[PDB]
mmCIF file of C-alpha atoms in Angstrom:
data_model
loop_
_atom_site.group_PDB
_atom_site.id
_atom_site.type_symbol
_atom_site.label_atom_id
_atom_site.label_comp_id
_atom_site.label_asym_id
_atom_site.label_seq_id
_atom_site.Cartn_x
_atom_site.Cartn_y
_atom_site.Cartn_z
ATOM 1 C CA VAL M 209 -1.250 -14.611 -29.235
ATOM 2 C CA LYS M 210 -4.766 -14.405 -27.789
ATOM 3 C CA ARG M 211 -3.822 -16.748 -24.939
ATOM 4 C CA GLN M 212 -0.697 -14.741 -24.082
ATOM 5 C CA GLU M 213 -2.729 -11.520 -23.961
ATOM 6 C CA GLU M 214 -5.221 -12.825 -21.384
ATOM 7 C CA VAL M 215 -2.462 -14.326 -19.227
ATOM 8 C CA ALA M 216 -0.735 -10.956 -18.823
ATOM 9 C CA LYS M 217 -4.019 -9.227 -17.962
ATOM 10 C CA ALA M 218 -4.781 -11.682 -15.146
ATOM 11 C CA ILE M 219 -1.425 -10.987 -13.489
ATOM 12 C CA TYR M 220 -1.902 -7.230 -13.903
ATOM 13 C CA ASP M 221 -5.345 -7.327 -12.271
ATOM 14 C CA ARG M 222 -4.006 -9.283 -9.285
ATOM 15 C CA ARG M 223 -1.243 -6.722 -8.702
ATOM 16 C CA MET M 224 -3.809 -3.900 -8.788
ATOM 17 C CA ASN M 225 -5.879 -5.518 -6.030
ATOM 18 C CA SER M 226 -2.909 -6.092 -3.709
ATOM 19 C CA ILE M 227 -1.797 -2.451 -3.921
ATOM 20 C CA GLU M 228 -5.259 -1.152 -3.004
ATOM 21 C CA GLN M 229 -5.623 -3.362 0.081
ATOM 22 C CA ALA M 230 -2.196 -2.398 1.435
ATOM 23 C CA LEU M 231 -3.115 1.290 1.134
ATOM 24 C CA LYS M 232 -6.080 0.994 3.511
ATOM 25 C CA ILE M 233 -4.032 -0.819 6.164
ATOM 26 C CA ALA M 234 -1.190 1.713 6.026
ATOM 27 C CA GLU M 235 -3.551 4.638 6.634
ATOM 28 C CA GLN M 236 -5.307 2.812 9.485
ATOM 29 C CA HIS M 237 -2.115 2.029 11.425
ATOM 30 C CA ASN M 238 -0.590 5.408 10.437
ATOM 31 C CA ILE M 239 2.713 4.183 9.004
ATOM 32 C CA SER M 240 4.514 6.683 6.768
ATOM 33 C CA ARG M 241 8.196 5.695 6.946
ATOM 34 C CA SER M 242 9.979 3.227 4.660
ATOM 35 C CA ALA M 243 10.700 0.220 6.868
ATOM 36 C CA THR M 244 12.627 -1.629 4.137
ATOM 37 C CA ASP M 245 14.975 -0.274 1.470
ATOM 38 C CA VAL M 246 14.114 -3.101 -0.957
ATOM 39 C CA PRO M 247 12.378 -1.518 -3.982
ATOM 40 C CA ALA M 248 8.723 -2.282 -4.621
ATOM 41 C CA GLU M 249 9.530 -3.941 -7.961
ATOM 42 C CA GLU M 250 10.815 -7.067 -6.221
ATOM 43 C CA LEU M 251 8.517 -7.364 -3.254
ATOM 44 C CA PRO M 252 6.293 -10.394 -2.618
ATOM 45 C CA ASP M 253 2.573 -9.720 -2.921
ATOM 46 C CA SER M 254 2.186 -10.222 0.838
ATOM 47 C CA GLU M 255 4.356 -7.381 2.137
ATOM 48 C CA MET M 256 3.473 -4.000 0.663
ATOM 49 C CA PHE M 257 2.655 -2.765 4.177
ATOM 50 C CA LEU M 258 6.414 -2.438 4.745
ATOM 51 C CA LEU M 259 6.267 0.866 2.864
ATOM 52 C CA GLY M 260 5.175 4.366 3.738
ATOM 53 C CA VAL N 209 -4.885 -27.602 -11.875
ATOM 54 C CA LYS N 210 -6.700 -28.545 -8.657
ATOM 55 C CA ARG N 211 -3.499 -30.029 -7.220
ATOM 56 C CA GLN N 212 -1.629 -26.757 -7.799
ATOM 57 C CA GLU N 213 -4.309 -24.842 -5.884
ATOM 58 C CA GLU N 214 -3.949 -27.051 -2.798
ATOM 59 C CA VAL N 215 -0.145 -26.861 -2.853
ATOM 60 C CA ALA N 216 -0.265 -23.071 -2.507
ATOM 61 C CA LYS N 217 -2.847 -23.474 0.264
ATOM 62 C CA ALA N 218 -0.429 -25.527 2.379
ATOM 63 C CA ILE N 219 2.355 -22.941 2.094
ATOM 64 C CA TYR N 220 -0.081 -20.117 2.872
ATOM 65 C CA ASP N 221 -1.343 -21.944 5.972
ATOM 66 C CA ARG N 222 2.224 -22.458 7.209
ATOM 67 C CA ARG N 223 2.886 -18.710 7.005
ATOM 68 C CA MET N 224 -0.281 -18.083 9.032
ATOM 69 C CA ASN N 225 0.935 -20.159 11.979
ATOM 70 C CA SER N 226 4.427 -18.634 12.004
ATOM 71 C CA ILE N 227 3.146 -15.069 12.410
ATOM 72 C CA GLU N 228 0.575 -15.983 15.074
ATOM 73 C CA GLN N 229 3.189 -17.681 17.265
ATOM 74 C CA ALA N 230 5.407 -14.591 17.080
ATOM 75 C CA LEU N 231 2.549 -12.443 18.392
ATOM 76 C CA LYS N 232 1.882 -14.882 21.240
ATOM 77 C CA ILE N 233 5.435 -14.763 22.595
ATOM 78 C CA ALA N 234 5.761 -11.010 21.995
ATOM 79 C CA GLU N 235 2.490 -10.380 23.863
ATOM 80 C CA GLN N 236 3.529 -12.758 26.675
ATOM 81 C CA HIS N 237 7.133 -11.919 27.556
ATOM 82 C CA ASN N 238 7.627 -8.386 26.208
ATOM 83 C CA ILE N 239 4.202 -6.966 27.106
ATOM 84 C CA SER N 240 2.720 -9.197 29.804
ATOM 85 C CA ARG N 241 5.808 -9.767 31.972
ATOM 86 C CA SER N 242 7.826 -6.632 31.148
ATOM 87 C CA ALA N 243 6.965 -2.959 30.743
ATOM 88 C CA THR N 244 8.183 -2.871 27.124
ATOM 89 C CA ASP N 245 5.311 -2.035 24.772
ATOM 90 C CA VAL N 246 4.249 0.392 22.039
ATOM 91 C CA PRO N 247 4.634 3.501 24.285
ATOM 92 C CA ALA N 248 8.348 2.625 24.605
ATOM 93 C CA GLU N 249 8.884 4.567 21.338
ATOM 94 C CA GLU N 250 11.948 4.065 19.097
ATOM 95 C CA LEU N 251 9.602 2.277 16.671
ATOM 96 C CA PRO N 252 11.073 3.822 13.452
ATOM 97 C CA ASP N 253 14.723 2.754 13.887
ATOM 98 C CA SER N 254 15.394 0.125 16.557
ATOM 99 C CA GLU N 255 15.843 -3.033 14.422
ATOM 100 C CA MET N 256 14.184 -5.693 16.586
ATOM 101 C CA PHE N 257 11.878 -3.161 18.249
ATOM 102 C CA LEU N 258 10.950 -1.843 14.799
ATOM 103 C CA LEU N 259 9.533 -5.349 14.289
ATOM 104 C CA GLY N 260 7.570 -5.135 17.522
#
Protein backbone atom coordinates (compact mmCIF):
# COMPACT_ATOMS: atom_id res chain seq x y z
CA VAL A 1 0.00 0.00 0.00
CA LYS A 2 2.85 2.39 0.82
CA ARG A 3 4.62 1.53 -2.43
CA GLN A 4 1.48 2.09 -4.51
CA GLU A 5 0.95 5.50 -2.90
CA GLU A 6 4.41 6.82 -3.83
CA VAL A 7 4.15 5.47 -7.39
CA ALA A 8 0.98 7.48 -8.07
CA LYS A 9 2.52 10.65 -6.63
CA ALA A 10 5.55 10.44 -8.93
CA ILE A 11 3.33 10.28 -12.02
CA TYR A 12 1.20 13.16 -10.74
CA ASP A 13 4.25 15.37 -10.16
CA ARG A 14 5.55 14.70 -13.68
CA ARG A 15 2.22 15.71 -15.23
CA MET A 16 2.25 18.96 -13.22
CA ASN A 17 5.66 19.94 -14.60
CA SER A 18 4.73 19.29 -18.24
CA ILE A 19 1.62 21.48 -18.03
CA GLU A 20 3.57 24.43 -16.61
CA GLN A 21 6.27 24.35 -19.30
CA ALA A 22 3.72 24.22 -22.14
CA LEU A 23 1.98 27.30 -20.72
CA LYS A 24 5.08 29.50 -21.05
CA ILE A 25 5.68 28.47 -24.67
CA ALA A 26 2.06 29.09 -25.68
CA GLU A 27 2.12 32.65 -24.33
CA GLN A 28 5.48 33.37 -25.99
CA HIS A 29 4.39 32.28 -29.49
CA ASN A 30 0.88 33.73 -28.93
CA ILE A 31 -1.19 30.66 -29.83
CA SER A 32 -4.78 30.72 -28.57
CA ARG A 33 -6.70 28.43 -30.95
CA SER A 34 -7.21 24.68 -30.53
CA ALA A 35 -5.09 23.11 -33.26
CA THR A 36 -6.25 19.56 -32.45
CA ASP A 37 -9.67 18.30 -31.36
CA VAL A 38 -8.15 15.37 -29.42
CA PRO A 39 -8.96 15.92 -25.71
CA ALA A 40 -6.13 16.64 -23.30
CA GLU A 41 -6.83 13.44 -21.34
CA GLU A 42 -5.19 11.31 -24.03
CA LEU A 43 -2.36 13.50 -25.20
CA PRO A 44 1.30 12.46 -25.02
CA ASP A 45 3.40 14.47 -22.58
CA SER A 46 5.28 16.03 -25.50
CA GLU A 47 2.45 17.86 -27.26
CA MET A 48 0.46 20.14 -24.96
CA PHE A 49 1.49 23.10 -27.13
CA LEU A 50 -1.16 21.96 -29.63
CA LEU A 51 -3.76 23.66 -27.43
CA GLY A 52 -4.86 27.23 -26.90
CA VAL B 1 16.63 -0.13 -14.38
CA LYS B 2 19.61 1.47 -16.15
CA ARG B 3 18.77 -0.39 -19.36
CA GLN B 4 15.23 1.01 -19.35
CA GLU B 5 16.59 4.56 -19.06
CA GLU B 6 18.78 4.17 -22.16
CA VAL B 7 15.96 2.61 -24.20
CA ALA B 8 13.82 5.72 -23.73
CA LYS B 9 16.84 7.86 -24.61
CA ALA B 10 17.15 6.22 -28.04
CA ILE B 11 13.49 6.84 -28.90
CA TYR B 12 13.72 10.44 -27.67
CA ASP B 13 16.82 11.06 -29.80
CA ARG B 14 15.05 9.68 -32.89
CA ARG B 15 12.19 12.15 -32.42
CA MET B 16 14.74 14.99 -32.18
CA ASN B 17 16.19 14.25 -35.62
CA SER B 18 12.79 13.89 -37.32
CA ILE B 19 11.63 17.37 -36.29
CA GLU B 20 14.92 19.06 -37.18
CA GLN B 21 14.90 17.65 -40.72
CA ALA B 22 11.36 18.95 -41.25
CA LEU B 23 12.49 22.46 -40.33
CA LYS B 24 15.46 22.24 -42.71
CA ILE B 25 13.35 21.41 -45.77
CA ALA B 26 10.59 23.85 -44.79
CA GLU B 27 13.15 26.65 -44.36
CA GLN B 28 14.87 25.70 -47.65
CA HIS B 29 12.12 25.17 -50.22
CA ASN B 30 9.11 27.02 -48.77
CA ILE B 31 10.95 30.03 -47.34
CA SER B 32 14.31 30.26 -49.10
CA ARG B 33 13.25 29.48 -52.68
CA SER B 34 9.60 30.60 -52.57
CA ALA B 35 7.78 33.59 -51.10
CA THR B 36 5.62 31.42 -48.83
CA ASP B 37 6.30 32.21 -45.18
CA VAL B 38 4.60 33.24 -41.93
CA PRO B 39 3.18 36.51 -43.41
CA ALA B 40 1.22 34.35 -45.90
CA GLU B 41 -1.49 34.06 -43.20
CA GLU B 42 -4.11 31.27 -43.18
CA LEU B 43 -2.20 29.79 -40.23
CA PRO B 44 -5.31 28.80 -38.16
CA ASP B 45 -7.06 26.58 -40.74
CA SER B 46 -4.98 25.54 -43.75
CA GLU B 47 -4.08 21.92 -42.84
CA MET B 48 -0.51 21.64 -44.14
CA PHE B 49 0.12 25.38 -43.75
CA LEU B 50 -1.24 25.17 -40.20
CA LEU B 51 1.75 22.87 -39.63
CA GLY B 52 4.12 25.42 -41.11
